[PDB]
Assembly symmetry: C3
């Protein structure tokens, strides 16, 4: 027995679960199965207290226990922006158009307005908590490029380094990528367990994402009238 | 699509779930469905480490994951006082007698003894955590008064501004109320989504209620002998 | 009604659930039923990021929501060391050999390497969190000794006061024990609700065990290649 064999057997199981238009369903199932249970994953819209909506997001990772509400409307799910940790776009194959599309979706979430309130206590008032740093990314099974994880993909990822920045992602047939804040560049990792390596990159980053802030629930509630 | 429509559709769903003697069952189901999952709701007694019991509480909101124990006895549920966040009395119609009764029930919880222990750490000892500020209230479908949310109801709510104080509540046919600590007075909100407006008032207040303290579990355990 | 009667009825229920080689199954079921839901219990191996494994542990108590991963391999469960709170050895009857065996198992967990990372924030960097103080113990239904909870058992427990130290345990027919850090000695409590008294000792200690640290997930992930 070895820790390497455990990882190989986990990847075999993930590949079974996993194996364009509707490819997000299997990524949802995988992430809702293997993320720490404090997180929840779903296909969802994101909304803010100003009544603005994101695009429809293939995979939203949000707080399971501490989200204040989750709307269920016309067979869709809508989550408040303040309880979102990550957002992914899925499609069968990576291309320049899909990367740009993923960037636009992710931007549509990050441009929402998130609230965060100060916290009273007996002695006085603690400052408002920081907002969650929302991770963005893309999930595909294949790539239109040859090589799959090379200069052309890197150029596409570099097309949005602000609101639409993709922090990480997976091409299931070849590997995964993540943005390296130190060197300010994308890193590619090629390997024979891509989805599992992606999962471990995501879990490693999420544990530093903090927690849901004190939300201006009253501001959401004004829309009751 | 609009955030207002989401709230209207949530209220329609809540009204379906909701629609004296046994009216608490539907409020339990509603709150256990729509409160953040960190909370749990049930019909329960509350107990303290001195062996004292509250009255039977129609709706108790308590900590789901961090309560140290939940007794199941003779088909009743009994929760320790330290893990309670809110307590409600339900009946079909509001009246002076029901308000006074709700106040007496809520007082019977707040008069229990709650423990809170200091917290050691390598450097030294952190002070004991604050107790949860227990919210009290009343939940009805109708009112005996005309107007339902007016001077007579306000006078009844003002009959107990200490241990039995009701912080918030709902008359499902007309609106909701909450105590305004700034002006030291009750506020009524009339509207066409009462139960949902009540739910949002409760969720907004709960997020500032803190967490379960370090409980004197040993003191409870003395009752093993 | 009295708090004593609640405890007596809880113990009756626990005795129903409970009543060598495979005795751990009923202790798992009991602890996974009655521990606070933040905890989870299972028969499991423990692993560290250096690829080292503990012995197979009859009962591991670990973090339910915040464990980063739980391997499922060849019908066994494997948990990372950093998310473990307690480890128990079970057998039908206590003896010197079983105590020594429990000590060796517990040591095999505590000798694993646990990581804990510093925590950045806007202002700077908070120190790494403390590791969870792992509780060890033994769970039996009977004892080979007469008296069951006496000098011979105390001598056996005193055979390992370091990596293999057993902090607490239960002989279901007679009582429970726990290590008293103040007097540096084992205390025995004889009584007619042993398993329930043991449960309350465990819950009291766990609430001071802290939380899972920031784990070097990257270090685990190196084993993907
Ligand atoms: Cl962000
Ligand atoms: Cl209070
Ligand atoms: Cl330890
Ligand atoms: Mg898609
Ligand atoms: Mg009632
Ligand atoms: Mg055993």
């Amino acid at each position: 027995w070895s820790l390497s064999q455990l990882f190989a057997s986990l990847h075999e199981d993930i590949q079974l679960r996993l194996g364009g238009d509707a490819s997000e369903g299997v990524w949802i199932e995988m992430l809702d199965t293997y993320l720490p249970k404090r997180y929840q994953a779903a296909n969802a819209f994101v909304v803010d207290s100003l009544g603005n909506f994101s695009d429809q997001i293939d995979v939203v990772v949000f707080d399971r226990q501490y989200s204040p509400f989750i709307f269920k409307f016309n067979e869709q799910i809508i989550v408040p922006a303040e309880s979102v940790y990550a957002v992914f776009e899925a499609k069968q194959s990576a291309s320049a158009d899909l990367v740009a599309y993923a960037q636009r979706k992710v931007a549509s979430v990050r441009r929402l307005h998130r609230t965060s309130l100060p916290i009273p206590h007996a002695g006085g008032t603690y400052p408002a908590k920081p907002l969650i740093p929302i991770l963005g990314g893309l999930l595909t099974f294949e790539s239109d490029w040859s090589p799959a994880l090379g200069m052309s993909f890197d150029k596409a990822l570099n097309g949005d380094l602000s609101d639409g920045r993709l922090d990480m992602g997976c091409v299931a047939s070849h590997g995964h990528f993540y943005f390296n804040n130190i060197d300010s560049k994308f890193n590619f990792e090629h390997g024979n367990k891509p989805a599992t390596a992606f999962l471990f990159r995501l879990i490693a980053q999420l544990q530093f994402s903090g927690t849901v802030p004190m939300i201006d629930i009253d501001a959401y509630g004004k829309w009751l009238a």
